[PDB]
Design a binder for these strands. Sequence first.
DNA 1: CCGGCTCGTATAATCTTATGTGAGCGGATAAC
DNA 2: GTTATCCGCTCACAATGCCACACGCCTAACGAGCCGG
Lengths: 50, 172
Amino acid sequence: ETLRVDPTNDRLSALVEIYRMMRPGEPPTREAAESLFENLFFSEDRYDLS
Amino acid sequence: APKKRWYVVQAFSGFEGRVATSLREHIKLHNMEELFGEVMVPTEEVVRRKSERKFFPGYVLVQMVMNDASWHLVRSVPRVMGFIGGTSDRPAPISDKEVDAIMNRLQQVGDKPRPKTLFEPGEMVRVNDGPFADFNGVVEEVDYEKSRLKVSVSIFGRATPVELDFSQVEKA
DNA sequence: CCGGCTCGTATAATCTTATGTGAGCGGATAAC
DNA sequence: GTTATCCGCTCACAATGCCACACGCCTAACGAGCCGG
């Protein structure tokens, strides 16, 4: 049901959609969205569980 | 070929002197070098009292071609606030008569002619050398060949003519 | 012999356990 | 069709009084100052 709710379809479009959620108005670019999604979770610098 | 055009960039209050140089090193580093056009910042000189005033306080004029790589190159410079355009995601380029007027307002620093060697007769000027040092007087004729100004200094309410030099008088 | 240092001072920036209201406004919703 | 309603989302605004006590309330870099090398 949720997968029939969402407008977003694929990977680069998903990164664009998250990248538009986090900061509005910024240019949706492939590498900037990739770096944003990496820096949110999958890196030691800004996501540290103990 | 894309036309490298001017854009206006916000910065902090007094950090923008280093921002242009650091931007030049980012351009040298990231190998986007065939796209940019020797950015600058306008300054001028005003007359210890004299100073060198920045022409626009806290704004930088930058040559761009405006692809998104250029956007994220400029925004990845450590003291850069966002572009100043008509809208977000697309900054408006500055017009052509304004860039002609801003390159024209840096073309007034050209002297020599006419410092002292071209001088007119009949002008009340001052004299700073000899016994007539710091006194006003009306020049009568200008001898360019003999290099002797015939200046009648107004002393005691009376014109006293004397042969002087261009460096021995003050043009007032 | 102007500012390299040193100082007087004027002034710009990357949260994350709250509830209950009302009040308004944008998006769906059921008619001739 | 198109029109007059119904409903969900978002956001401003309130939350007793008094007392003592106590410690806090800028500075990296742009215009001046001294005079050494």
